[model samples]
Target: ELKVTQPEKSVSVAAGDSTVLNCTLTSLLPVGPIKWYRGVGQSRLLIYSFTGEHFPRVTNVSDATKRNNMDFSIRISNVTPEDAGTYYCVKFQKGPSEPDTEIQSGGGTEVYVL
Candidate 1:
């Protein structure tokens, strides 16, 4: 089984401010990369695909160990009302010889940009 945790339930920002959301995942063993989603479920939309060296206003501030046991943060800059929504973290694990499984975080971090 897997579990995902987000500490901040809600955050408020101004039109031109920045904020960071924290996430942590725990499991019986090490898994694959951590992914960020913009909505509630697996089929909603992918915000971070666990690829590339960088993402605009989004980043992983930790390594695999942080992914497996500790924490990671995704930052958003220049906040706008359109940027307000529920953001979730999903633990994705898969391999050529392994079955793909996703653990989604319920009750995401809500942002209110004014």
Candidate 2:
């Protein structure tokens, strides 16, 4: 999210179906950008970091949003062990004059196969 003014919300996805994950955060971080990430198990390392790895095995169904109260989503057509895990949308921002950068973490989404 580029301009977040509110806290991000959480979402969920299942196997063998189209999955949509979203995050809503309100703030005044215009020019800020958000990235998506996925992790496994509790306290596990980040499985997929959005920025470094662009469109790894999964692809985004829609364009990513950064404005606060904004929503973004990604879709997965088929689900498998490789696709089974937690997904999270995230973003970070730093101003031209600001010496430090601000990090914004969106809510988490965990996908499971029945």
Candidate 3:
């Protein structure tokens, strides 16, 4: 089974300071794209690897040097008040349908900007 773990449950950063939301994968490496989302019940897609689309300030920082592609972290540059929220790292499995299905997700990391 695939599992996602976010080491830090919460993080605090000052406005304009960059913050890295950490995500680690376990069990197996995923064959599909990794994604990041924000918000609670109403989630918004912030990053999608398959489409190569993401917020201008958000960048996937999962190091290529890491073995098994275990990392799926993201770095948000110049964090502002708008950036404060809960962030999630998700593993997506593409199917025959137009939209990919979410297979796994981290517990979520809350970002607090001052």
lDDT tens readout by residue for model 1, 1-114: 567788667898998899998886565234455677786544777766543222223344334544344465688888877788888776655443444466455448888887
Ten-residue stretch with the least lDDT total in model 2? 48-57
Q: For each candidate, what is the lDDT?
A: 0.65, 0.50, 0.72
The most accurate candidate by lDDT is 3
Which tens-of-lDDT digit does each residue in 1-114 have in candidate 2?
343332244334455666666556564333344555567454555433333222223333333454533554555676665666667665554344433243766556666755
Best by TM-score: 3
- Give the poorly placed runs of model 3, Cα more than 4 Å off: 27-30, 48-68
Off by over 4 Å in 2: 1-14, 40-69, 94-102
Candidate 1: list runs displaced more than 4 Å.
Answer: 40-43, 51-69, 97-100, 104-106
Q: Arrange candidates by lDDT, highest first: which order?
A: 3, 1, 2
- TM-score-wise, the better of 2 and 3 is 3
For candidate 2, give the lDDT of residue 45.
52
Q: Tens-digit lDDT track for model 3 on 58-100?
A: 3443344654557777789999999898888888764544476
Better of 1 and 2 by TM-score: 1
lDDT (C-alpha) at residue 80 in model 3: 91
